[PDB]
Amino acid sequence: VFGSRNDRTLRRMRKVVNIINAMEPEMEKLSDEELKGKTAEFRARLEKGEVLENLIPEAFAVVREASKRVFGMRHFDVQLLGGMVLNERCIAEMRTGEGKTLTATLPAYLNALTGKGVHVVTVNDYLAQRDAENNRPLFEFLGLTVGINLPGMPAPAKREAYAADITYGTNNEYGFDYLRDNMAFSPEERVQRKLHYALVDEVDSILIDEARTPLIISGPAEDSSEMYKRVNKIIPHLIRQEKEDSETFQGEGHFSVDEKSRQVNLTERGLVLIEELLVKEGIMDEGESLYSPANIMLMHHVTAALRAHALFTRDVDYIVKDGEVIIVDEHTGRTMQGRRWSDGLHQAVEAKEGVQIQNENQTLASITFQNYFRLYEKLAGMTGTADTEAFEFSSIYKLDTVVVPTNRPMIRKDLPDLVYMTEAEKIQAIIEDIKERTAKGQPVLVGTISIEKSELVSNELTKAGIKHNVLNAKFHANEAAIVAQAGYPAAVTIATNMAGRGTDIVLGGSWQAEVAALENPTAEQIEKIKADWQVRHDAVLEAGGLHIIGTERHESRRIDNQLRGRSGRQGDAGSSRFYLSMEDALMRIFASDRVSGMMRKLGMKPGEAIEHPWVTKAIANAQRKVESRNFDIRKQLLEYDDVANDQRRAIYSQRNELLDVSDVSETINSIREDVFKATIDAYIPPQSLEEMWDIPGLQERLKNDFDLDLPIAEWLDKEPELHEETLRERILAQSIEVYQRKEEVVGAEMMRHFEKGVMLQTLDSLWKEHLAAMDYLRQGIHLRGYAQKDPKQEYKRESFSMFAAMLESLKYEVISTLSKVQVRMPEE
Amino acid sequence: MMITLRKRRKLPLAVAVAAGVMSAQAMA
């Protein structure tokens, strides 16, 4: 892209808009089938040597033309600007009323021409299926295909929707689909296509709030994981006092009077008790430490058995009857038979006693939305008039913030904040502001964020004698009835914490809702009501438009601005008036209410409008400061997230390669020699002495993990010229020979499929571990981050070592399993 | 004779718990 962002971008887009407007009269001379022909033409031109960004003038013109024949609505110039910006990797701010559907249709058609697939992200399935079928007669009219992806849709149908030019779906399913696709065994099992372009309807929520939302799939294999019972089996060999089993201890702990430390904690700062668990039996007995990133998984498993012994006492902390585990509450004497402590805690208990061990419930597959949308090349979306955290768009997703002009001039009179001392003053001032407008015939919308104030203002309004209708969310039918005339002259509507966007309240009321209340609305009736409605609309205009009143403001300006943007629909008339008291909790956001107390000496004067604009500016400053503090926190959290993100991306790339390719002999053989070398180097050091070689250890390992019986002691005994290198190669050669011999019995193509599957399976198996391991270290690093060292940097270091170790273990078991397989080999 | 006894029968059951969540199986 070229041209100064924002400033120059605005006029740059205008240059194209002019061309589109000039070519419009020409498009009106083109037949319906010609518009369709242009769409196909662009497809050909794109492969010929045409730039997508250069097709905008013609493409947008076709869309504008087609829309006039399909919907009869011409895409406004302001919409052309926004739709054009949505072709890049930027976020466009759209005012309430401009027309999101009439804007998002432009970038969709343009990017759809590439045939890569336009991924439209919706907040819910309602809008997803709504716009999908609504815009269908438009896109399909030009030849493009519209596909809808609903959560839970079968793979066959998904493939049809994903193979379409434009795909409508929810962010939730979008992420899950990606997970299922990447966790496939065969490339034909895929459901996705390409992450070329993504257009999200509301970034305010999906990109901001849902940024740190991880799609955790808890899909266990069930069965019976009796493997855990073999771990806890080593505990009864110890005594709770010394040698591993000890409730905290730390030398003393407490007196001999039921010293069961049920506060968990756990420590073992002696480093002499843990020495009893390590070594012997098998696994974690080779010489590995339990306080290493390459053994964090077992660390969180062995401690589970410990915190299931003296931590959870039988019959008091929990009760198991007939295999049914029920938690016993000692606080109020309650029994929880439908609950179980996660983090593998319940599993340790079920593995301690004669209970059937389950398959737990942890992260089988997970991905964060932020780490998902960041994979898309062209990531664009629409945002509301909220701003605030909008600055984080460039830091979280690296998107540029662009504002789109309104269709009509916004005549929303924004008034300053009138801060009073007591709530009585604040409320009374509101009543007065409303009462004065009740005589002028101006509709008043009270945005109470607190239910306590909603009833308070309602009682006060009744006291003064002012008509009012409260939007009780418990009665949607009531709300719809009020909203229909919420813009009616002198109509006081009270809203208790309204969600974003909201219904498009038309000034004067809604004749549609009026004619819909009649049995048979004839042409005469409709025209009559429209005539009356017209007068009602003009009346509100002379009154001052829709008057918004805010009793209390919100910390995050995102919601604050959302309420302010309720008026002036598509550039209409309105007035915003906010109030505040020294009793409201909002005065605590200024670091300390003691500071805000300086405003108590402003005079106030209940009944006199002090009108001080600097007050609003002060509040707005603090409002953005609150989120600035949150931003620092979000950044700190994302710091750890990106670490797992890169590792995930890396391992997913390798898994994808092995997924797409059919043959994997190259990889298998290349890692085969490496695995053997590493295993040999562990018993036989390079360029050492004969008496420095552990022949028995290597032989046993070969006859254990590689299923290869080789008498190395006999080989070197008769062949002294074997030296070392030749000896290593001999073992490898013999392995390859027997390997091929096993292969011939199973089948060449079959073995290749087997190896491919085993690689993916082993990778996935370790991936499940790594997912939990990352978490174990994520929280455990808090006790590892000492002074004179950054806890994030050290974490990344340990995480890198963990990943490396995982890779080594991957190649190890992959080659081992491929050899461990007991194939029925006949006498050759 | 020299009876070299060793605990080669190590118990990887503790590790199998991690892969237990997605324990797929083929022919063997």
Give CA–CA dist A493/A448, Å, rounded. Answer: 10
Tell me: is residue A99 an annotated ligand-binding position: yes
The region, left, alpha or beta by phi > 0 then psi within -120 to 50, assigned to residue A258 is left
Question: Shortest CA distance to A539 belongs to which of A561, A509, A511?
Answer: A509
Residue A573 dihedral angles phi and psi, to the nearest 5° = -95, 150
Residue A79 has which token pair? 């919409």
Residues A533 and A511 sit within 8 Å (Cβ to Cβ): yes
Helix (H) or strand (E) holding A383: strand A378-383
Mutation choice for B interface testing from A237, A769, A809, A819 by most B CBs within 10 A: A769
Q: How many CB atoms lie within 10 A of CB A65?
A: 25
> What CA–CA distance (Å, rounded) separates A757 from A618?
62
CA distance A60 to A13: 12
User: Where in chain A do CATH 1.10.3060.10 domains reside?
Assistant: 637-828
Assess contact for A802 and A293: CB atoms under 8 A.
yes
Assigned token pair, A382? 């629409």
Contact (CB, 8 A) for A97 and A570: yes
Buried b (16+ CB within 10 A) or exposed e, A251-268: eeeeeeeebbbeeeeeeb
Q: A221-360 maps to which CATH number?
A: 3.90.1440.10
Q: Sort out which chain A residues have CB atoms less than 8 A from B25's CB and list them.
A: none
What token pair was written down for A190?
């895929």
Both tokens of A304, joined, read 């589970």
* A97 labeled part of a ligand binding site: yes
Q: Identity (one letter) of the amino acid at A638?
A: L
Minimal CA separation from B1 to chain A, in Å: 16
**What's the one-letter identity of residue A484?**
A
The residue of chain B with its CA nearest to that of A222 is: B21
What are the residues whose beta carbons fall under 8 Å from the beta carbon of A646, sequence distance 6 or more?
none
DSSP secondary structure letters along A476-495: HHHHHHHHTTTTSTT-EEEE
Q: Which of A132, A126, A188 lies closest to A155, judged by CA?
A: A188
Residue of A nearest to B11 (CA): A282
Supply A501's token pair: 């966007």
CATH architecture assignment, domain A409-636? 3-Layer(aba) Sandwich (3.40)
Cα A409 from Cα A96, distance rounded (Å): 13
Tokens of A769: 């571990």
b/e for A804-821, b at 16 or more Cβ within 10 A?
ebbbebbbbbbbbbbbeb
Phi, psi of A616 (to 5 degrees): -60, -40
Residues contacting A788, CB < 8 A, separation 6+: none
Q: Which residue of A has its CA nearest to B10?
A: A282
Q: How far apart are CA A535 and CA A641, in angstroms?
A: 57
A101 assigned ligand-binding residue: yes
Interhelix angle A748-780/A791-820, rounded to 10 degrees, is 150
Which tokens sit at A729?
Answer: 């190669």
Distance set, CA A391 to CA A208, A382, A561 (Å):
11, 14, 15
Instruction: Select from A145, A165, A166, A142 the least CA-distant residue to A36.
Output: A142
Distance CA A695, CA A689 (A): 12
Of A282, A302, A822, the CB nearest to B7: A282
* CA gap A458, B12 in Å, rounded: 69
Helices (H), A781-826: 791-820
Q: Do the beta carbons of residue A167 and residue A120 sit within 8 Å? A: yes
CB within 8 Å: A359 and B4:
no
Q: Report the candidate in A712, A726, A731, A715 with the shortest Cα–Cα distance to residue A673.
A: A731
- Could you tell me where in chain A the CATH 3.90.1440.10 domains are found? 221-360
C-alpha–C-alpha distance, residues A532 and A9, integer Å: 44
Q: Phi and psi dihedrals of A445, rounded to 5?
A: -110, 110
Separation between Cα atoms, residue A352 and residue A228, nearest integer Å: 9
Cβ-based contacts of B14 with chain A (< 8 Å) = 227, 230-231, 283-284, 298, 301-302
CA angle A274–A279–A283, rounded 5-degree value? 110
| Bridge pairing between strands A90-93 and A378-383 | parallel
Q: Do A227 and B16 touch (CB under 8 A)?
A: yes
For residue A526, the tally of other CB atoms under 10 A from its CB is 15
Using an 8 Å Cβ cutoff, are A599 and A583 in contact?
A: no
How many C-beta atoms surround the C-beta of residue A539 within 10 A?
Answer: 18
A211, A396 in Cβ contact below 8 A? yes
Size of interface A-B (CB pairs under 8 A): 81
Name the 3-class secondary structure at A575: strand
Q: How many CB atoms lie within 10 A of CB A192?
A: 19
User: How far is A168 from A174, CA to CA, in rounded Å?
Assistant: 10
Q: Phi and psi (nearest 5°) for A411? A: -105, 55
**Which residues pair with residue A382 across a beta bridge?**
A92
Q: Does A231 contact B16 at a Cβ distance shorter than 8 Å?
A: no
Contacts of A282 in chain B (CB under 8 A): 7, 9-12
Give the integer Cα–Cα distance in Å for A810 and A577.
64
B-chain residues near A285 (CB < 8 A): 10
Strand order across the beta sheet in which A318-321 lies = A318-321, A324-328, A335-336
Q: Which residues of A574-601 are buried (b: 16+ CB within 10 A; e: fewer)?
A: bbbbbbbbbebebbebbeeeeebeebee
Instruction: In whole angstroms, give the CA distance from residue A71 to residue A68.
Output: 6
Q: Which CATH architecture has domain A1-220+361-408?
A: 3-Layer(aba) Sandwich (3.40)
What length is written for chain B? Answer: 28
Nearest to A123 by CA among A180, A173, A85, A160: A173
Does residue B1 sit at the A interface (CB-CB below 8 Å)?
no
- The closest alpha carbon to A95, from A381, A416, A386, belongs to A386
Distances (CA, A) of A418 to A427, A550, A594, A602, A605: 11, 10, 19, 11, 11
Q: How far is A557 from chain B (nearest CA, A)?
A: 43
DSSP B12: T
Q: Is B5 on the interface with A (CB under 8 A)?
A: no
Query: Is 3.40.50.720 the CATH number for A637-828?
Result: no
Distance CA A820, CA A700 (A): 14
Among A100, A633, A201, CA closest to A389: A633
Q: How far apart are CA A62 and CA A105, in angstroms?
A: 12
B7 and A CB contact within 8 Å: yes
Q: Which residue of A has its CA nearest to B4?
A: A696
Cβ–Cβ < 8 Å for A42, A50: yes
Residue with tokens 């249709």: A105
- B21 CB-side CA count, 13 A: 23
Q: Which residues contact A58 (CB under 8 A, 6 or more apart)?
A: A23, A38, A42
What does the block give as tokens for A821? 């397989």
C-alpha span between A202 and A101 (Å, rounded): 12
Alpha-carbon distance A278 to A285, whole Å?
A: 6
Residue pair B20/A227 in contact (Cβ under 8 Å)? The answer is yes
* Residues B14, A227: C-beta atoms closer than 8 Å: yes
**Candidate from A362, A700, A754 with C-beta closest to B6:** A700
Where would I find the H helices in A600-747? Answer: 613-660, 665-681, 695-705, 712-718, 725-746
Contacts of B15 in chain A (CB under 8 A): 283, 297-298
- Let me know the angle formed at the C-alpha of A52 by A117 and A143, rounded to the nearest 5 degrees: 50
- Out of A221, A754, A761, closest to residue B21 by CB: A221
Which of B17, B23, B25 is best to mutate for the A interface (most A CBs within 10 A)?
A: B17
* Apex A256 CA angle, A252 and A262, nearest 5: 75
Of residues A450, A461, A433, the one with CA closest to residue A576: A433
**Would you list which residues of chain A are within 8 Å, Cβ to Cβ, of chain B?**
219-221, 223, 225, 227-228, 230-231, 280-285, 297-298, 301-302, 359-360, 362, 364, 696, 700, 704, 754, 757-758, 761, 764-766, 768-769, 772, 821-822
d(CA A605, CA A611): 11
DSSP per-residue letters across A385-431: TT-GGGGGHHHHT--EEEE---SS--EEEEEEEEEESSHHHHHHHHH
Closest CA to A304 of A344, A246, A361: A344
Q: Coil, strand or helix: which one is A822?
A: coil
Chain A residue numbers with beta carbons less than 8 Å from the beta carbon of B11 are 230, 281-283
Tell me which H or E stretch contains A550: strand A546-550
CB within 8 Å: A281 and B4 = no
| Half-sphere CA count of A342, side-chain side, radius 13 A | 5
Give phi and psi for A417, each to the nearest 5: -95, 130
Start and end residues for every CATH 3.40.50.300 domain found in chain A: 1-220+361-408, 409-636
Determined by NMR
Best of A218, A227, A821 to disrupt the B interface (most B CBs within 10 Å) is: A227
Other Cβ atoms less than 10 A from the Cβ of A684: the count is: 19
The CA distances from residue A238 to A6, A244, A245, A470, in Å, are 70, 7, 6, 68
Min Cα distance A322 → chain B (Å) is 24
* Chain B residue at shortest CA distance from A362: B21
Distance, in Å, from the CA atom of A436 to the CA atom of A117, rounded to the nearest integer, reads 56
Residue in the structure block whose two tokens are 């759809």: A112
Q: Label the pairing between strands A573-581 and A411-420.
A: parallel
What six digits make up the tokens of A811?
Answer: 């190649």
CB distance A80 to A20 below 8 Å = yes
B10 contacts A283? CB cut-off 8 A: yes
Residue B6 with chain A: CB contacts under 8 Å: 700
End-to-end CA distance of chain A: 68
Residues with Cβ < 8 Å from B6, sequence gap 6 or more? A700
Distance in angstroms (rounded) separating the CA atoms of residues A1 and A799: 37
B23 and A765 within 8 Å at the Cβ level: the answer is yes
Any idea what DSSP says for residue A188? G
Mutate to test the interface with A, among B21, B23, B25 (most CBs of A within 10 A): B21
Cα-Cα end-to-end distance for chain B: 37
DSSP-based three-state secondary structure for A166: strand
Question: Is A142 in contact with A116 (CB distance < 8 Å)?
Answer: no
Query: What is the total residue count of chain A?
Result: 828
Answer whether A225 sits within 8 Å of B18, measured CB to CB.
no
- What's phi and psi for A76, nearest 5 deg? -60, 155
- The answer for residues whose C-beta is within 8 angstroms of residue A607's C-beta and 6 or more apart is A429, A432
Long-range residue pairs from A633-641, CB within 8 A, at least 24 positions apart, any chain: A634/A211, A634/A212, A634/A392, A634/A396, A635/A395, A636/A792, A637/A212, A638/A211, A638/A212, A638/A370, A638/A396, A639/A792, A640/A778, A640/A792, A640/A795, A641/A212, A641/A368, A641/A370, A641/A371
Query: Alpha helices of A199-354 — where are they, by DSSP H?
Result: 203, 229-232, 296-306, 345-352
Burial class (CB in 10 A: 0-12, 13-18, 19+), A452: exposed
Nearest-Cα residue of chain B relative to residue A305:
B14
